[PDB]
């Protein structure tokens, strides 16, 4: 993996944020397969594996700052980038900081701006999951999630762990987290979704991006 | 409530800016 221009994968990109922009505008969620390509992929599950190893993982919270493992199962840990080991986390963010430059102007109203760091988790099997919620609810700033999934040959009438979707449709989206898959959607009510209960180790990254006129009202 | 499940956002001191 080249972590640092070829005409087709420009090209590719180009007519990626084309598909992204017409399917969240049109159906609210984007599901790219095979984002970074195996090497590059396993790379960043390595990394996402050595910290994990590594003992700096904390529990997932919610709103008020506060952890209930019955609603929202997770351990996670923030990483900028820059951390030691971190070189394939670094590259994956890089790539969908790109991809949703090229979709700037072109989601919504939304002027992309910033974005959180890297939200590595953890659902450590054990039935571990997160109840059907809302990303933001309250007009947090979050304006795209986007999750990189990382689990190899998973197998999820075995061992769960889906991303549940209920797009604002009568109808449940349910999305396998295989390794590679790169899963947009809008943050807001539109998209209310679950984690379904893991029965294996289930890793994924995501990075929320903000709409700058919403998140200066969070400025403190 | 909606309201409670969010999932923590860090404040805006920690955003990265694009
Ligand atoms: O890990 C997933 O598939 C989904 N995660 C969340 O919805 C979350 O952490 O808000
Ligand atoms: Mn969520």
Known sequence: ?220 | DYDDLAPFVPPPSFDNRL
């Open chain 1, 1 to 220: 993996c080249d972590k640092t221009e070829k005409t087709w994968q420009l090209q590719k990109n180009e007519r990626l944020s084309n598909m992204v922009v017409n399917q969240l505008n049109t159906n609210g969620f984007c599901i790219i397969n095979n984002f970074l390509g195996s090497s590059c992929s396993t790379e960043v599950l390595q990394q996402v594996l050595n910290l994990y190893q590594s003992g700096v993982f904390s529990n997932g919270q919610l709103a008020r700052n506060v952890s209930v493992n019955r609603i929202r199962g997770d351990k996670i840990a923030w990483i900028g980038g820059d951390e030691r080991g971190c070189e394939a986390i670094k590259y994956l963010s890089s790539c969908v900081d790109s991809l949703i430059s090229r979709c700037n102007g072109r989601l919504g109203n939304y002027m992309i701006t910033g974005r959180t760091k890297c939200m590595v988790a953890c659902y450590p099997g054990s039935g571990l999951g997160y109840i059907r919620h809302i990303d933001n609810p309250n007009r947090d700033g979050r304006c795209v999630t986007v999750l990189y999934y990382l689990n190899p040959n998973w197998n999820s009438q075995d061992c769960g762990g889906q991303l549940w979707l209920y797009p604002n449709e009568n109808k449940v989206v349910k999305i396998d987290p295989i390794f590679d898959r790169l899963l947009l959607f809008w943050s807001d009510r539109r998209n209310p979704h679950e984690v379904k209960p893991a029965y294996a180790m289930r890793y994924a990254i995501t990075l929320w991006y903000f709409d700058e006129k919403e998140r200066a009202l969070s400025s403190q």
